[PDB]
Design an enzyme around this catalytic site. Structure first.
Site, PDB file in Angstrom:
ATOM      1  N   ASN A   1      41.227  26.377  87.672  1.00 12.12           N
ATOM      2  CA  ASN A   1      39.922  26.948  87.360  1.00 12.12           C
ATOM      3  C   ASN A   1      39.057  25.848  86.726  1.00 12.12           C
ATOM      4  O   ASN A   1      39.511  25.135  85.813  1.00 12.12           O
ATOM      5  CB  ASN A   1      40.119  28.119  86.393  1.00 12.12           C
ATOM      6  CG  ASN A   1      38.824  28.776  85.984  1.00 12.12           C
ATOM      7  OD1 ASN A   1      38.710  29.252  84.851  1.00 12.12           O
ATOM      8  ND2 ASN A   1      37.852  28.847  86.903  1.00 12.12           N
TER       9      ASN A   1
ATOM     10  N   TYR B   1      23.966  28.943  85.466  1.00 13.59           N
ATOM     11  CA  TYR B   1      24.897  29.404  84.453  1.00 13.59           C
ATOM     12  C   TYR B   1      24.484  28.925  83.054  1.00 13.59           C
ATOM     13  O   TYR B   1      24.041  27.793  82.875  1.00 13.59           O
ATOM     14  CB  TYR B   1      26.280  28.863  84.839  1.00 13.59           C
ATOM     15  CG  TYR B   1      27.354  29.029  83.803  1.00 13.59           C
ATOM     16  CD1 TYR B   1      27.892  30.277  83.522  1.00 13.59           C
ATOM     17  CD2 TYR B   1      27.830  27.930  83.103  1.00 13.59           C
ATOM     18  CE1 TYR B   1      28.877  30.428  82.567  1.00 13.59           C
ATOM     19  CE2 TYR B   1      28.817  28.063  82.145  1.00 13.59           C
ATOM     20  CZ  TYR B   1      29.337  29.317  81.881  1.00 13.59           C
ATOM     21  OH  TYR B   1      30.328  29.456  80.940  1.00 13.59           O
TER      22      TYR B   1
ATOM     23  N   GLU C   1      26.928  35.243  77.989  1.00 14.41           N
ATOM     24  CA  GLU C   1      27.263  34.239  78.994  1.00 14.41           C
ATOM     25  C   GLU C   1      26.616  34.817  80.256  1.00 14.41           C
ATOM     26  O   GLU C   1      26.825  35.989  80.561  1.00 14.41           O
ATOM     27  CB  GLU C   1      28.776  34.140  79.179  1.00 14.41           C
ATOM     28  CG  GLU C   1      29.210  33.165  80.267  1.00 14.41           C
ATOM     29  CD  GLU C   1      30.715  33.147  80.470  1.00 14.41           C
ATOM     30  OE1 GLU C   1      31.363  34.198  80.286  1.00 14.41           O
ATOM     31  OE2 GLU C   1      31.249  32.077  80.803  1.00 14.41           O
TER      32      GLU C   1
ATOM     33  N   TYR D   1      25.127  34.445  84.537  1.00 13.46           N
ATOM     34  CA  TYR D   1      25.232  33.863  85.867  1.00 13.46           C
ATOM     35  C   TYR D   1      24.182  34.426  86.819  1.00 13.46           C
ATOM     36  O   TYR D   1      24.012  35.646  86.919  1.00 13.46           O
ATOM     37  CB  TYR D   1      26.566  34.249  86.512  1.00 13.46           C
ATOM     38  CG  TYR D   1      27.802  33.677  85.906  1.00 13.46           C
ATOM     39  CD1 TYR D   1      28.420  34.294  84.820  1.00 13.46           C
ATOM     40  CD2 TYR D   1      28.380  32.536  86.444  1.00 13.46           C
ATOM     41  CE1 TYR D   1      29.589  33.784  84.287  1.00 13.46           C
ATOM     42  CE2 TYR D   1      29.537  32.020  85.925  1.00 13.46           C
ATOM     43  CZ  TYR D   1      30.144  32.644  84.847  1.00 13.46           C
ATOM     44  OH  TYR D   1      31.314  32.119  84.344  1.00 13.46           O
TER      45      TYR D   1
ATOM     46  N   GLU E   1      31.673  26.527  90.440  1.00 14.97           N
ATOM     47  CA  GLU E   1      32.908  26.963  89.793  1.00 14.97           C
ATOM     48  C   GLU E   1      33.896  27.091  90.922  1.00 14.97           C
ATOM     49  O   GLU E   1      33.519  27.503  92.016  1.00 14.97           O
ATOM     50  CB  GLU E   1      32.741  28.359  89.178  1.00 14.97           C
ATOM     51  CG  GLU E   1      34.044  29.010  88.623  1.00 14.97           C
ATOM     52  CD  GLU E   1      34.862  29.887  89.626  1.00 14.97           C
ATOM     53  OE1 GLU E   1      34.678  29.830  90.868  1.00 14.97           O
ATOM     54  OE2 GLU E   1      35.735  30.646  89.147  1.00 14.97           O
TER      55      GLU E   1
END
Length: 190
Positions: free
Chosen positions: A44, A77, A86, A88, A177
């Protein structure tokens, strides 16, 4: 240049590169607002360029090539403090829709496409202020693309109508990502 995980400014732009230590990802800072990521059977990771601090009315431009081979996404982001959020604004994704499992709040039209809005809570998760509990906000673009312009204000306004009131904006980047997949990307932010 190719670097290990970290943050800083490069050729005029803030960059942030993070990975889970798995291996299989190569992140390189390029000229201007360009960054490249090449990965193969990675873990990740998240990497990209933008601004620190960001703003609530920035119009972000991005272009380049985005070639995911499996689970991955390309999005604006960033984070907010007070409240801790957070967020996106997903422009494109690979095999998995990142909003899967999140609660749909509504829809917003911006920059040539309708976006579906979602929110999900993260309990005792890592964050820019440490281990904390916060919401994750998502705007997922219906018509996927790898280049264009994102008027962040349209998203922040729509989220505000749904009850989200952003506070102090922290970093704000266009990021690639990857999640245990492979792929390549070369993106230029401006």
């Amino acid at each position: 240049q190719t670097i290990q995980p970290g943050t800083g400014y490069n050729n005029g732009y803030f960059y942030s590169y993070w990975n889970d230590g798995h291996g299989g990802v190569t992140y390189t800072n390029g000229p201007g607002g360009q960054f490249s990521v090449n990965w193969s059977n990675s873990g990740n990771f998240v990497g990209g360029k933008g601004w620190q601090p960001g703003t609530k009315n920035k119009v972000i431009n991005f272009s380049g090539s985005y070639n995911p081979n499996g689970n991955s996404y390309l999005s604006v982001y960033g984070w907010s403090r007070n409240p801790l959020i957070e967020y996106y604004i997903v422009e494109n994704f690979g095999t998995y829709n990142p909003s899967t499992g999140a609660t749909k709040l509504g829809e917003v039209t911006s920059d040539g496409s309708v976006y579906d809005i979602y929110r999900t809570q993260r309990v005792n998760q890592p964050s820019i202020i440490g281990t904390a509990t916060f919401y994750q906000y998502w705007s997922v673009r219906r018509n996927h693309r790898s280049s264009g312009s994102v008027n962040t204000a349209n998203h922040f306004n729509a989220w505000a109508q749904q009850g989200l009131t952003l506070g102090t904006m922290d970093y704000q980047i266009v990021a690639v990502e990857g999640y245990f997949s492979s792929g390549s990307a070369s993106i230029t932010v401006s």
